[PDB]
Write a protein that binds this ligand. Structure first.
Ligand SMILES: O=C(O)CNC(=O)C(=O)O
Ligand SMILES: [Mg+2]
Ligand code: NI
Ligand SMILES: [Zn+2]
Length: 331
C-alpha cells in the first residue's frame, strides 16, 4: 500500500507531465497521495497562470465577510457578518492597515502560534466565494476554468445526462482569515491555486480517519451536533492542532505559497488560515474514483448548509433515498 502513514505528498511535474490533468491526478493517486487528503503540486518552471497581476484592483468583492469568532482559542465557531462592497484595491489597502496587517514574526511556525493564540480576539474580513477566474485564456495547462465538468464525469461514468454547471471561485484573504473544518460538497475533490500574495496554511485529516474528526466535533460542539447530523457542512467550526493532538486525531499540516496548487481528495477534511493579503482560485472536480464517495456523502438537511444549484442533480442521481429530505432543507 503506497503512503501508508498518509503523509502530505509534494509533486513536481515536468512540463510534459503538466499537459494531461486527469492523467496526473491518477498518477498522484498511484503513489498514495490521496491517503493524506491533500497534496501540493509545484508547476513546472516554464508555466505561468497569467502574465501579470497588475490589473486586478477593479474586481469587486460584493459581499465581504467579517469572520466573528465565539468560544475558546482552540475550539471556536465563526459567523460571517456581511459588510459593504469594496474593490480588490480597497480590500488590499484594508488588509495592509495597522488594524488588519500580519504582525511581526520570525517564521511560519511563529506565525502559526500567533494565529492559534490570538485568532478569536479579532474579526478579519474575507472576500470569499466570488465567481470568476484569473487564469489567462491562453493558459492551456491546469487552467481551473477549463477543467472537465463534474456533470460530464457523472455522464461518462454512469450514462445519465444532468443539468448544472461547474465554475471557479476567487478568494481574497487577509491575516487570520479562516476556513473552517469541512469536506467538499458531495465529498468532491477540490483544487486551489494561490495566485498571489501571502501564504495559506492548511490542516487535513486522512479520508480513512474522517469519522474520528466527526466524533470529536460532536463532542466539542454538542448543541450544533443535536441541531444537525452533518453540522460540519455548515463550515463554521474550528479545532486547533493542539486540541486535535490531545484527542489523538490523525492530521497533517502544510503551508501553500504563491504559485502553488493544492488538491483536496474526496472526504479529506481540511481547515486553515491566510498569512496576509492573498488571492486564491478554487474549483471542485471529480474523477471515476469519486463516484463511490459521492454516493456515501453526508448531507445537511437542517437548512443551514444551503448550496449551489448543481448539487441537486448529484443528490438526485447518487442518493435518491435522501433526495426528498435534503431538498426540503434547500426549500
Ligand atoms: O482557500 C480557502 O478559503 C478555502 N479553500 C478550500 O476549502 C478549498 O480549496 O477546498
Ligand atoms: Mg481589475
Ligand atoms: Ni475546501
Ligand atoms: Zn445542517
Amino acid at each position: 500500500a503506497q503512503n501508508p502513514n498518509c503523509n502530505i505528498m509534494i509533486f513536481h511535474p515536468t512540463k510534459e507531465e503538466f499537459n494531461d490533468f486527469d492523467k496526473y491526478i491518477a498518477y498522484m493517486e498511484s503513489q498514495g497521495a490521496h491517503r493524506a487528503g491533500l497534496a501540493k503540486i509545484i508547476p513546472p518552471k516554464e508555466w505561468k497562470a497569467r502574465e501579470t497581476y497588475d490589473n486586478i484592483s477593479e474586481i469587486l468583492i460584493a459581499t465581504p465577510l467579517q469572520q466573528v469568532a465565539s468560544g475558546r482559542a482552540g475550539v471556536f465557531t465563526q459567523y460571517h457578518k456581511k459588510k459593504k462592497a469594496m474593490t480588490v484595491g480597497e480590500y488590499r489597502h484594508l488588509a495592509n492597515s495597522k488594524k488588519y496587517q500580519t504582525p511581526p514574526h520570525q517564521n511560519f511556525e511563529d506565525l502559526e502560534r500567533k494565529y492559534w493564540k490570538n485568532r478569536i480576539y479579532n474579526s478579519p474580513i474575507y472576500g470569499a466565494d466570488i465567481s470568476g477566474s484569473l487564469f489567462d485564456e491562453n493558459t492551456k495547462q491546469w487552467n481551473l476554468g477549463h477543467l472537465g465538468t463534474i456533470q460530464d464525469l457523472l455522464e461518462k461514468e454512469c450514462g445519465v445526462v444532468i443539468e448544472g454547471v461547474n465554475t471557479p471561485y476567487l478568494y481574497f484573504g487577509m491575516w487570520k482569515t479562516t476556513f473552517a473544518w469541512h469536506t467538499e460538497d458531495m465529498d468532491l475533490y477540490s483544487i486551489n491555486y494561490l495566485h498571489l500574495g501571502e501564504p495559506k496554511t492548511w490542516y487535513v485529516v486522512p479520508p480513512e480517519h474522517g469519522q474520528r474528526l466527526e466524533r470529536l466535533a460532536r463532542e466539542l460542539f454538542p448543541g450544533s451536533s443535536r441541531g444537525c447530523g452533518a453540522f460540519l457542512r455548515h463550515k463554521v467550526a474550528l479545532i486547533s492542532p493542539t486540541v486535535l493532538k490531545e484527542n489523538g486525531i490523525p492530521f497533517n499540516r502544510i503551508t501553500q505559497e504563491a504559485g502553488e496548487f493544492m488538491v483536496t481528495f474526496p472526504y479529506g477534511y481540511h481547515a486553515g488560515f491566510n498569512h496576509g493579503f492573498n488571492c486564491a482560485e478554487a474549483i471542485n472536480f471529480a474523477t471515476p474514483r469519486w463516484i463511490d464517495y459521492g454516493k456515501m456523502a453526508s448531507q445537511c438537511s437542517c437548512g443551514e448548509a444551503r448550496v449551489t444549484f448543481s448539487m441537486d442533480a448529484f443528490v438526485r442521481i447518487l442518493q435518491p433515498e435522501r433526495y426528498d429530505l435534503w431538498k426540503r432543507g434547500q426549500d
